Structure formats: C-alpha cells, structure tokens
Amino acid sequence: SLLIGVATSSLALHAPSQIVAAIKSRADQLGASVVVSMVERSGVEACKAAVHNLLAQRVSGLIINYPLDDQDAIAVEAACTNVPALFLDVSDQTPINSIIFSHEDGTRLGVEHLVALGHQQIALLAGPLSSVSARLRLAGWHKYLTRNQIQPIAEREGDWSAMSGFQQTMQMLNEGIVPTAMLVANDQMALGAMRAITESGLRVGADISVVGYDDTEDSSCYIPPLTTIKQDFRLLGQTSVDRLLQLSQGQAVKGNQLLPVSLVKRKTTLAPNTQTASPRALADSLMQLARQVSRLESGQ
Amino acid sequence: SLLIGVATSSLALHAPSQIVAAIKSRADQLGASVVVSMVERSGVEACKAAVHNLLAQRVSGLIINYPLDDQDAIAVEAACTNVPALFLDVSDQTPINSIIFSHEDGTRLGVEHLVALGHQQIALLAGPLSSVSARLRLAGWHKYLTRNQIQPIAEREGDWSAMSGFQQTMQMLNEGIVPTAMLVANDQMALGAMRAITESGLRVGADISVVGYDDTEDSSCYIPPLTTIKQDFRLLGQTSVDRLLQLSQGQAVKGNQLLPVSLVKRKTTLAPNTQTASPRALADSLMQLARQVSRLESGQ
Amino acid sequence: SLLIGVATSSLALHAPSQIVAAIKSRADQLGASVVVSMVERSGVEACKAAVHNLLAQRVSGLIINYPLDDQDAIAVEAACTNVPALFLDVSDQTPINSIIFSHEDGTRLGVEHLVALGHQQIALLAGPLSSVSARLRLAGWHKYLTRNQIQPIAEREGDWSAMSGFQQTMQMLNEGIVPTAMLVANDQMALGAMRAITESGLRVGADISVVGYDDTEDSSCYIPPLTTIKQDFRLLGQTSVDRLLQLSQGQAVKGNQLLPVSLVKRKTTLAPNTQTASPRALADSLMQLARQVSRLESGQ
Amino acid sequence: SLLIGVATSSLALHAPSQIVAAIKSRADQLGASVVVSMVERSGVEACKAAVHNLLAQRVSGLIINYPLDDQDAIAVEAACTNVPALFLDVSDQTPINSIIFSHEDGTRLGVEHLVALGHQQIALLAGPLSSVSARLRLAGWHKYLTRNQIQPIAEREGDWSAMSGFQQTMQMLNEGIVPTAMLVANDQMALGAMRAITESGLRVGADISVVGYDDTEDSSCYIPPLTTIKQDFRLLGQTSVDRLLQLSQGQAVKGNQLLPVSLVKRKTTLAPNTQTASPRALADSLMQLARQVSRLESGQ
C-alpha cells in the first residue's frame, strides 16, 4: 500500500479542507493512500487521540494539520513513536519537522500594501488566539504597523467564521469606529467584514479597504473580489507529501521549511477617500458599462 | 470502541466538509471513532478504491458521501462485503441503504418561491450532470416549472465551484440572455452568479433574483445574504451516524430515508424588475467616468 | 458480453471523434464493449476491409461512421453477412439501416438565418464532394437559397480542414468576390474562413458573416464565437448504440431515421448593413479603453 | 494478419485523435491492422479494462496512449502479460517501454522564447495535474523560469479543453491579474485563452503573448495563428508502431525513447508592450464613445 495519516482541524473551515485535498492529490500521484482523522477543537489531547487512532491504522507517517504550540507539538511528535510526523500549523521556531507559510511575509505584505496606498486608520480582525497561526498573524500585523509608525485604531477577535467577521465588524462600526482599511486573519472572516461594511452603507475598497488571508477558493468570487495573502495550499500538500516520504526513507530532511506567500491584488483595496478615483477602479466601472452597452444589441 | 469509515467527495466543496464535520460531531457524542477517506471526481472506480481503503482499516460500517448512479451504487455496496454501507448521495430509487434530502421539496420550494414573487423568466444553473444529485435537482426544477407552465429561458451547467457560477452566468448575460431570476444548484455557484450579475451592471435581488441550494455556512454572509434551500447537514450527520450503528447491529432499518428541506429567505429575491437602462443613462455614466480619467493628469 | 464494431473516418476530424466518444459512453452505460476500426480516405474498398477486420473480431453489430455513396453503402452492407449494420454517413434515401442528421433542416436553418438578417450576397464553402454528406449540404444550400430568390455568388470546395477553409476563402477574396455572408460545411473550415476574412482586414460578422456546421466542441471559443448548425453527437451516439442493439435483437426497426438539428446563434452573424457604432463595436472599444485606463496604475 | 491494439484516452481531444490517426497510417503502410479501444473514463482500472478488451482480441502488441502515473503504468504493463506493450503518456522515468516527447525541451523552448522577447510577467496555464504529462510540463516551466530568475505571476489549471482555457484565462484577467505572456499546456486551451484575452479588450500578441503546446492541426488557422511547441504526432505514430513491431519480434531495445520537439513561431508572440496612453487622450476617446452610445437612444 503505503499509507499516510492526516490529523486535521475542523474541515468546516475552507483552508484545512483545501490542504487535505492537496495532500490527497499528491498522494494519488505517487500511489500512496491517505486516511484522515478529524480533530475536535479541544486542543493537544484531542490531537493526541487522533494520532493514536492513526497509529492504530498502521500509517507509515503523519501529517499534522492542527494548531499546536511549541511544547504541544513536541508532545504530539513524541506520541508518534518511530513513525515520522510533519507539522503544518506550528511556529517555525518549534524544533520538529514542519512546513509553514511565512507569517512574517504574509503580515508584512498586507500592512505594506495598505500603508503604500495611504491608509493610516487600520482595524485588525484576528482569528482566535488559541490558534498559533492567529497569534503569529496578529503579532506580525502589530510589528509591521508599528514599524511604519501606525497603531491600529481598533482590534477584534473572530473565530475564523464569516458570521464572526460580520458580528465583530458590525459592532466596531456600531461603536462609531470607522477605519479606512482592515486586515483580516482569513478570507471567511473577510467576507463577513465586507458584508458589515456594505450593510453600513459603505463601499468595500473605496470607503473601507479589506485584505484577507489565504486565498481560499471562493475569494475571487466575493463582491468585490477579495485582495488577500495567498497561501498556496496545493504547494503545501504537494511538498508535505513529498517530504513525509523523504522522511520515511530516512532522508536527512529534518526541521522547518518555510513556504513563500504573496499578495493577490483584486478589488477590495484602494487609496483612502481622496478626490481622484483610481485607474483600476475607473477601469472596472468602464468594463461594467461596456457589458451594459453590449446588451443594447438584438438577438439573431 | 467502534470505527465508522467515511468515503467523501472532495472536502474542497463546502457541503461535504460540513457533512463530515457533523458525522464526527455525532460520533464523538456517542464514543465512536471516525476515519475518512477522500475520493477523486473519477466516479465508481475511485469510489471503490476508497471503500477498499476503509475496509482494510476494519471499520464497523461505511458512510458513502459521494455521488453514485443507480448501477454504480449497487456495485459499491457489493464491494463492502460483510460491513454495512449507508449512502448519502444517490437517488432515493436505488435499492440500497440511503439518507437523502428531498429533491422534490427543494426544487418545488425554489420554483414556487420565484413564481409567487412574479418571475416567469427563469434561468437554471445546474451542478455537473455526472452527479446524480445535480440531475435530481435539474429534473425537479423542470418538473415544477412545468407544473407552473414555464419553460426556463436558459439552462447552464457548472461544476459546483464559485468560479463556475461566475463563468456560466457571465457567459449567459453576455449572450443577452437576462433572466429576472436564477435557480442555482448550490450556494458556492450562487456566490459566483451574484458576482457576475453585479459586474454585468445589474443588481442581485432587484434586477436578477437568485436562489441557491444547501445553505452552507457562509451564505448568510454573502452580499446580499443568499436566499437558499437549507439542507441541514447537522441533521444528516447525526441521523447518518445513528443509522449506521443501527445497521451494524443488524437492526430492521434497511432502505431509504428522505430528509426535509426548507427555504431560507434572505436578501437575494424580489419581484421582477421591468425597466432596463437607456443609452443616454449609460452615456451619462461614461461621460462622468471620462471626466475622472482626464483628471489623472491635471484636475486632481 | 456484447461487442459493437465501429468503422470510422481516420482524418482526426473533430465531428467523427466526438461521435465515437459518444458511442463509447452509451455503450459503457449499457455494459457493451466497443472495438473501433479506422478507415483510410479511399472509399468502398477501405471500408469493406474495415468491416472484415471487425467481423474477424466477432462483433455482434456494426456502426459505419464513414461516408458512403449509395451503391458503395449497399456493397458495405453486403460485406456484413450475418451481422446488423447501421450507417451514419449516407443519404437518407439509401435502402439500408441508417441514422443521419437532417440535412434539409440544417441547410434551411443556415440559409433562413442569413436571409432574415438581410444577406443577399452569399458564398458557399463545401466539404469535399467525394463525401455524400458534403454533397447533401451543398445541394441543400442551393435549394433554400433558390427558394428565397438568391443565387450564391461563389461556391468553393475544401477538404474539411481548417487550412482548406483559409486557402479557399483567401482565393475567393483574391478573385475579388466579397460576399456579406458565407455558409460553411463544417466548423473547422469555418475557422479557416474566419482567419482569411480577418487577415484580409474584414470583420467576421459585420463585414462577412459566417455560419458553420456541427457545433464541434471548440466552436464556442473561436474568435468571435461561431454561429453554427448543431448536430448533437451525443444524441447520435446514444441512438445509434440503442438502435444497433435493437437490430441485433430482431426489432422491426429497419431503414432510415433522421435526427433533428438546430441553429446555435453566436457572434459571427449580423445584418450586412451594420452601422459602425453598433452596441457590440462600442462595447469592444470601451473594454479596450478600460484596459488602457487600468494600465495607469503603478507602485500603488 | 498482424494486429495492433491501441488503448487511447478520449478521441474528443485533438492530440490523442491525431496520434491514433498516425498509428493507423503507419500500420496501413506496413500491412498491419489496428483495433482501438477507447477509455472515456479516468483511472487505471478503466485503462486495464481496455487492455483486457484488446487482449481478448488477440492483438500482437499494445500501444497505450493514456496518461499513467508511474505505479499505475507498471500495473497496466503487468495486465498485458505476454504481449508487448508500449506507453505513450508516461514519465520517462518509469521502467516500462515508452516513447515520449521531450518535456524538458518543450518547456525550455516556450520559456526561452518569452524571455528572449523581454517577458518578465508570465502566467502558466497547466493541463489537469492528474495527467502526468501535464505535471511534467508544469514542472519544466518552473525549472526553466526559475533558471531565468522569473517566478510566474499566476498559475491556473484547465482540463485540456478550449472552454477551460477561456474560463481560466477570463477568471484570472477579471480577478485583476494581467500577465504580458502565457505559457499554455495545449493548443485547445490556448484557443480559449486567446478568446478571453480578446474579449477582455486586449490583443493577442501585441498585449498578451501566447505559446501553445502540440501544434495540433487547427493551430495554424487560429486568430492570430498560434505560436506553439510542435509535438510531431505523425512521427509519434510512425515510430511507436515500428517500435512495437520490433518489441514483438524481441529486437527489444527496451525502456524509454525521447522524441524531439520544436518551437513553431507564428503570430501570438511579440515583445511586451511598454506604451501607455495619456489620460487626456483616453478621456477624449471615452467622451467620443459616450456620445456614440447616447446616439443609440434610438438612432439607427
């Protein structure tokens, strides 16, 4: 056979779902089988139970896509016994085998994008601080904002869901707190924020700019399509499967590898309320008008 | 004790992800373990491979959440040998153990909703017709439109993804086929359809009404919030886990169960609009944009 | 274990490939097997050789998807000995078992479309007239043009390939014959015609309208998308396999059946008097202008 | 009396159809017969089923023109038992008998053409990565881009079809991602991409350069004529048949042979456009267009 175990967080969230699907696609290509154990949001012990389950299934190596701090990751690794384990949601600092997206770059890129557009009044929508990725991202935003001499005007915590993004953003705006831009810790929350902005009678981009994090699959189809930090989950799943097999063959490939990230510029960010509309915004308006003009035609 | 194996369509689609999450939730409540094997879009061959994968793990029963045509479903059941199999994506006509949402109700509800609002110019955006569930939805839409003395003015086929909703809808509009309402086979495709409507210079709800299908988690935070057919994936997860346990003890519960659906009315459906934009109005907007373009050099 | 033999055209023309794909899908659905023999350009002897080869493979029935003139089809049928034979590229007046698309309707539909648009100066681009279907199509165009008091201003013969469409159309134009519309015997030749028109500095549609024949798969992606006569090859595949299996069972279903066709109106046909600032042309110009406006963004 | 079996992926794709036609021409020249078994489905068992159909037919050898991952290729070869098998769509690293076009050269040539022209902003449009040839091409592009110190600005995946080319390219462009050049994994997808470029308001060649892959038959008649990597399918057919006959006479030089490919320069590649219109001149053209649009308020 050749059997890979994956311990994953709630596949209710889009990013972990795309990661397991990428892992599966690479496995298929290499003729490896994959079995998935889902971890309840309780933490290390739930994660340890999943690993034990997977070890009972006679897996040849583990991919752990679940948020773990330094000592918990080490504890989860120790429970893996001889079989190799590769961690996908940890700090790059933890001394285990891991493949992580660069949080330093993801956070920087979002901040600098907004700073270079002229934003000063920036609000932050964090993920749940129980997640190491949420902590890393929030701390990065803070670092690069202060480096650019900005303190955010407000700061809220969601739970990774769209509804939390709506409720947090809506409560901020209801308090009279109106940023020109938001950094949001995932694209699902960013959707909710975007909805809150829109339903407050403000325009996403033009009035309040929004930057998500992930580039999960739907984001290109948000209204307007979402500017976001792309984490290439297909790359992650491919590299993680290849590395797990290297590890199982005794390839001296141990420790952290970082994966680069990028900013995908779509339509949710513009310079803040300055009496000259941006070229990209004008162009989109003109394209929309072009479609309306074309439909002035007949039908034969 | 007790290991339930789940063979699932790609978790990159939200309904399947929510369903395995709900299965896991009930299993955890009852003290049962879950192992998931994910299947590629290939059909029956790929479904059998996963079933074989799970049968190796010594599962007590199989929940198969993967679309299978009548003959293929029977073939997969035969492949389970001595372990009970429960199918979640099949026609309710196939003689196996299944739990399925009412497609008659879901489709009727969608059609009747739009008709009652006053729509007569209705487009259908189908799921990929290789899926039995897409075909049942499409057939239900035709059934009920016909009962309501309507032929759909257009009929297009997506692949369940938001991008396919965007592409199909943009293409339809660019042919000068402009319905007053669309029935869409899932909410992710509806998200795309809404974007396409919007970037074509039309208003969701006001110019083109949209009804999705699933009420997946993000839909209440679409812009505008999406009117959709709710299929309660928590109910399916819980009832499917309980049913599997019943079957595994050889209890007298073989056959099909139909679950109910409901309409969740949000903000994407209104009575149909009459009037189109005039050339003069379009020209007026163009002249305004031309003035903004000119002040990109002098006028700022 | 029932085995269908298909003798097909060996020119890697898109219509015959789609037809054999469609025969295979239907066969797959019914649990029949398919062996395909490809037939060289040379006519009756080649086709007979292919039949003998399929007969030696112990086929239960033959589908002959290869153009045969009346007496040649009769000869090919006589070569078939025991086994039922169904012809898909013959006149509907040949006394054998056949299913063909309606050439009366296909030719009428193209002619009446151009006529209703107001074209009077029409050129014909025929397939190779060794093909019975090419002859039927050319005869049909002449027939419906004459019934509408029009004689074509030129008639050329290609060989079904795109390059023949280009070469024949360039030649016509280089003789100084410039029709406002062309009827073309297949979509591949239509592609070539479209290139010739475009490269001679004329607009496909507004200067020379083009109607293809088949709606092969690529046609919706030509520039501009091609107006064509759709021959539904999936329908042909399905009905042919069913009919052949019925014949093998001694069903009294002998003779010719005609399939319907339809006109797919896309972007290559307009009135010949189109004003220069039409909705279509204006919209295209706006899109180009919008793109140039978008280019003014940089370092934002 | 010499009978060659061909197991081929769907003939609805132009490259495989050209390959089967080339196999047939060569066999004809040699006095050999060919029987074709079509695999309309994705998977190793679909392929093994074809091999089984063919062996039942007492073929003296098999040509397997179907994408196979390394281990599935080995498995299919085993299924052939005593009869020689030659693979056409595999990695050249697989230890089986194969003839394959040089992916290293094809990818190098496409990349080096664009680089030599001055392109730095390059998007990749891959085939479906379930296909090994698609992964080989994608990998080659990365290798040669990275050797030229270029990271691609976008990377999308189609399914070989023209419509997927159109949709992936349109989605990208309208997301707000615009390269100066595209490397595309086949010609049919390139046709679609060219359509999307054109309909977006850009010129193929002058604004976005496109390089296809295959030089399938229609490509010289695309608009504009497509620059592409030619894989000579006549040569593949001829050489594959000849090699099969050697193998079946145990003149068995076994394993992989690479066929050369070449760049066919036509009309879709130019230096990147650096020109850029003045805002005043764009505003002036826009006002002219606005007035022509207004004029449609009913004027002919």
Please provide the DSSP assignment of A57-85 as one string. Answer: TT-SEEEEES---HHHHHHHHHHTTTS-E
Contact residues on chain C for B296, CB-CB shorter than 8 A: 296
**Residue A160 contacts B, CB cutoff 8 Å:** no
Of A279, A293, A300, the CB nearest to C283: A293
The token pair at D154 is 């976008």
Please state, in angstroms and rounded to a whole number, the distance separating the CA atoms of residues B8 and B19: 9
CB C38 within 8 A of CB D24: yes
CATH topology of domain D1-101+231-260: Rossmann fold (3.40.50)
Is the Cβ pair C278, A297 closer than 8 Å?
Answer: yes
Of A279, A280, A294, the CB nearest to C279: A294
Identify the CA nearest to B13 among candidates B38, B49, B47. B38
Of B53, B191, B295, the CB nearest to A33: B53
CB A61 within 8 A of CB A83: yes
CA distance C124 to chain D (A): 19
Q: Is D263 helix (H, G, I), strand (E, B) or coil?
A: strand
Identify the CA nearest to C236 among candidates C251, C250, C257. C257
Please state, in angstroms and rounded to a whole number, the distance separating the CA atoms of residues B75 and B71: 6
CB D125 within 8 A of CB D170: no
Exposure string over B183-197, b if 16+ CB within 10 A, otherwise e: bbbbbbbbbbbbbbb
Q: Is the peptide bond before C224 cis (omega within 30 degrees of 0)?
A: yes
For residue D221, the 8-state DSSP code is G
The order of strands in the sheet holding A256-259 is A256-259, A98-101, A85-87, A61-65, A3-8, A33-38, B33-38, B3-8, B61-65, B85-87, B98-101, B256-259
The token pair at D187 is 């010609």
Exposure string over D109-148, b if 16+ CB within 10 A, otherwise e: bbbebbbeeebebbbbbbbbbbbbbbbbbbebbbebbeeb
**Residue D175 contacts A, CB cutoff 8 Å:** yes
Q: Hey, of C218, C289, C296, which one would you mutate to test binding to chain D, going by the most D CBs within 10 A of its CB?
A: C218
**Residue B296 contacts D, CB cutoff 8 Å:** yes
Q: Is D194 helix (H, G, I), strand (E, B) or coil?
A: helix
Is the Cβ pair A25, D70 closer than 8 Å?
Answer: no
CA angle C127, C129, C134 (to 5 degrees): 50
**Residue A25 contacts C, CB cutoff 8 Å:** no
CB D148 within 8 A of CB D108: no
Of A278, A290, A299, the CB nearest to C290: A290
Beta bridge partners of A259: A101
For residue A296, the 8-state DSSP code is T
Is the Cβ pair C113, A300 closer than 8 Å?
Answer: yes
Is the Cβ pair A31, D72 closer than 8 Å?
Answer: yes
CB D280 within 8 A of CB B297: yes
Is the Cβ pair A280, D176 closer than 8 Å?
Answer: yes
Please state, in angstroms and rounded to a whole number, the distance separating the CA atoms of residues D234 and C109: 38
Neighbours of chain C (3+ CB pairs under 8 A): A, B, D
**Residue D11 contacts C, CB cutoff 8 Å:** yes
Amino acid identity for residue C134 in this structure: A
DSSP result, C32-85: -EEEEEEE-TT-HHHHHHHHHHHHTTT-SEEEEES---HHHHHHHHHTTTTS-E
CA angle D266, D268, D273 (to 5 degrees): 130
CA distance B285 to chain A (A): 8
Is the Cβ pair D171, A220 closer than 8 Å?
Answer: yes
Q: Name every residue whose Cβ is closer than 8 Å to that of residue C15 and which is 6 or more positions away in sequence.
A: C186, C214, C216, C231, C233
**Residue C291 contacts A, CB cutoff 8 Å:** yes
Please state, in angstroms and rounded to a whole number, the distance separating the CA atoms of residues B179 and B177: 6
**Residue A176 contacts B, CB cutoff 8 Å:** no
Please state, in angstroms and rounded to a whole number, the distance separating the CA atoms of residues D67 and D137: 13
Amino acid identity for residue D93 in this structure: Q
Neighbours of chain A (3+ CB pairs under 8 A): B, C, D
Amino acid identity for residue C115 in this structure: V
**Residue A250 contacts C, CB cutoff 8 Å:** no
Range list of H helices, C124-232: 132-147, 162-174, 187-199
Give the nearest chain D residue to A24 (CA atoms): D130
Resolution (A): 2.1
Contact residues on chain A for C293, CB-CB shorter than 8 A: 279, 282-283, 286
**Residue C252 contacts D, CB cutoff 8 Å:** no
The token pair at C249 is 């069972």
Q: Name every residue whose Cβ is closer than 8 Å to that of residue A244 and which is 6 or more positions away in sequence.
A: A4, A61, A62, A63, A84, A86
Contact residues on chain B for C293, CB-CB shorter than 8 A: 293
Of C282, C287, C297, the CB nearest to A279: C297
Contact residues on chain D for C267, CB-CB shorter than 8 A: none
Is the Cβ pair D297, B278 closer than 8 Å?
Answer: yes
Please state, in angstroms and rounded to a whole number, the distance separating the CA atoms of residues B263 and B111: 11
Torsion-angle region of C81 (φ positive above 0: left; ψ -120 to 50: alpha; else: beta): left
CB C54 within 8 A of CB C7: yes
The token pair at D39 is 């695999």
Identify the CA nearest to D174 among candidates D137, D202, D207, D152. D202
Query: What residue spans define the domains of chain D?
Result: 1-101+231-260, 102-230+261-276
Chain A neighbours among C 187-246 (CB < 8 Å)? none
Please state, in angstroms and rounded to a whole number, the distance separating the CA atoms of residues B64 and B89: 8
Of B21, B174, B285, the CB nearest to A12: B21
Please state, in angstroms and rounded to a whole number, the distance separating the CA atoms of residues A47 and A64: 8
Q: Show me where chain A is broken: residue before each gap, C-N > 2.5 A.
A: none
Give the nearest chain D residue to B159 (CA atoms): D164
Contact residues on chain A for D293, CB-CB shorter than 8 A: 293, 296
Helix (H) or strand (E) holding B91: none
Range list of H helices, A128-250: 132-147, 162-174, 187-199, 233-248
Domain spanning A102-230+261-276 has what CATH number?
A: 3.40.50.2300
CA distances in angstroms from D148 to A236, C236, D114, D152, D265, listed in the order given: 24, 50, 11, 11, 21
Please state, in angstroms and rounded to a whole number, the distance separating the CA atoms of residues D290 and B281: 10
Phi then psi dihedrals of residue B226, to 5 deg:
-85, 125
Contact residues on chain C for B286, CB-CB shorter than 8 A: 286
CA distance C252 to chain D (A): 30
Is the Cβ pair C191, D220 closer than 8 Å?
Answer: no
Strand pairing category for C122-126 and C181-184 = parallel
Name the experiment that determined this structure: X-ray
Helix (H) or strand (E) holding C24: helix C14-30
For residue D13, the 8-state DSSP code is S
Beta bridge partners of A214: A230
CA angle A104, A107, A109 (to 5 degrees): 100
Please state, in angstroms and rounded to a whole number, the distance separating the CA atoms of residues D211 and D269: 7
Is the Cβ pair C283, A290 closer than 8 Å?
Answer: yes
Q: How many helices (H) and strands (E) does chain D have?
A: 9, 12
Q: Show me where chain C is broken: residue before each gap, C-N > 2.5 A.
A: none
Please state, in angstroms and rounded to a whole number, the distance separating the CA atoms of residues C39 and C22: 18
Please state, in angstroms and rounded to a whole number, the distance separating the CA atoms of residues C105 and C263: 9
**Residue A296 contacts D, CB cutoff 8 Å:** yes
Q: CA neighbours within 13 Å on the CB side: how many for A95?
A: 2
CB B90 within 8 A of CB B100: yes
- Work out the number of other CB atoms within 10 angstroms of the CB of residue D74: 16
CA distance D69 to chain A (A): 6
CA angle A31, A34, A40 (to 5 degrees): 165
Identify the CA nearest to C131 among candidates C218, C189, C54, C194. C189
Phi then psi dihedrals of residue B106, to 5 deg:
-65, -45
Please state, in angstroms and rounded to a whole number, the distance separating the CA atoms of residues B235 and C278: 55
CB B141 within 8 A of CB B111: yes
Exposure string over D202-218, b if 16+ CB within 10 A, otherwise e: bebbebbbbbbbbbbbb
Beta bridge partners of A65: A8
Mutual orientation of helices A14-30 and A233-248 as an angle, nearest 10°? Answer: 50
**Residue C118 contacts A, CB cutoff 8 Å:** no
The token pair at D41 is 């489905």
